Design a protein that fits this description.
Radius of gyration of chain B: 13 Å
Oligomer: heterodimer
GO cellular component, one term (chain A): midbody
Family (chain A): Belongs to the small GTPase superfamily. Ras family.
Largest interface: A-B, 14 and 13 residues
Order of helices and strands of chain A: EHEEHEHEHEH
Strand content of chain A: 25-35%
Shape of chain B: elongated
Number of strands of chain B: 0
Bound molecules: phosphoaminophosphonic acid-guanylate ester, magnesium ion
Distance between the termini of chain A: 11 Å
CATH class of chain A: Alpha Beta
Structural class of chain A: alpha/beta
Number of strands of chain A: 6
Radius of gyration of chain A: 15 Å
CATH topology of chain A: Rossmann fold
Catalytic activity (chain A): GTP + H2O = GDP + phosphate + H(+)
Helix content of chain A: 25-40%
Organism (chain A): Homo sapiens
Membrane topology (chain A): Lipid-anchor
């Protein structure tokens, strides 16, 4: 349905999937880390003058079973693939996450996906150069946006940009 | 509805019930055959669990 956009947060443990979701949902941020099992949210928003609902599934970066992960990925319409700019290993992990999304969505030509480099407020701790992350997004044919769940930088942008991709795909079918 | 309990024991009991439903949904969905109705029910159960866990705190 064009009235409901199903977004999945994907990425390694501790990158800020939940922090981005909760900043977008409720305008809150806390530094306390609680690893996620699986959480979900729904919000009414206005996208380009149109009243829509966004559903967000916030996945575990430390997930136990591949079958559980695959069930979540299969149900999504678009994906925020998140890494922390302060953790190179979280950036390299995004390749395998994307592979898993592609495999579960086997017969879809192009999957709505945005690459999100979170924790932009910790520039002094950056381990992932902007050029490296952007070049990877270009190789995947997707956009790269840097966010901070703490300062709100680009948080609304990533959710709304992905919704626009989901909309464009939905209007092509 | 499911968010109506006000005791820690009652909220925990509703969490245990929703997690049971969630596990049963995953068992059904792990066959890999598309089922948008069951996927929608799974997201709803997760929304309820998320709401319950916030009430629990
Ligand atoms: N400075 C800063 N800290 C952030 C940012 N986003 C998240 N954090 C912090 O990083 C930690 C991990 O955040 P969290 O959202 O729980 O990560 P997650 O990806 O959901 N982890 P998991 O997969 O285990 O659920 C928390 O301590 C959180 O406050 C950000 O943009 N800036
Ligand atoms: Mg989380």
């Amino acid at each position: 349905s064009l009235a409901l956009h199903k977004v999945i947060m994907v990425g390694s443990g501790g990158v800020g999937k939940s922090a981005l979701t909760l900043q977008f949902m409720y305008d809150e941020f806390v530094e306390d880390y609680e690893p996620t099992k699986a959480d979900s949210y729904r919000k009414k928003v206005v996208l380009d003058g149109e009243e829509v609902q966004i559903d967000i599934l916030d996945t575990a970066g430390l997930e136990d079973y591949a079958a559980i992960r695959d069930n979540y990925f299969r149900s999504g319409e678009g994906f925020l693939l998140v890494f922390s700019i302060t953790e190179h290993e979280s950036f390299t992990a995004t390749a395998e996450f994307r592979e898993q999304i592609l495999r579960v969505k086997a017969e879809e030509d192009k999957i709505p996906l945005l690459v999100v480099g979170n924790k932009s407020d910790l520039e002094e701790r950056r381990q992932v150069p902007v050029e490296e992350a952007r070049s990877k997004a270009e190789e995947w044919g997707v956009q790269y946006v840097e966010t901070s769940a703490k300062t709100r930088a680009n948080v609304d942008k990533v959710f709304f940009d992905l919704m626009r991709e989901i909309r464009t795909k939905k209007m092509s079918e | 509805g499911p968010l109506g309990s006000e005791t820690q024991a009652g909220i925990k009991e509703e969490i245990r019930r929703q997690e049971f439903l969630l596990n049963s949904l995953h068992r059904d969905l792990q066959g890999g055959i598309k089922d948008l109705s069951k996927e929608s029910r799974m997201w709803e159960v997760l929304r309820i669990l998320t709401a319950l866990r916030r009430k629990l705190r």
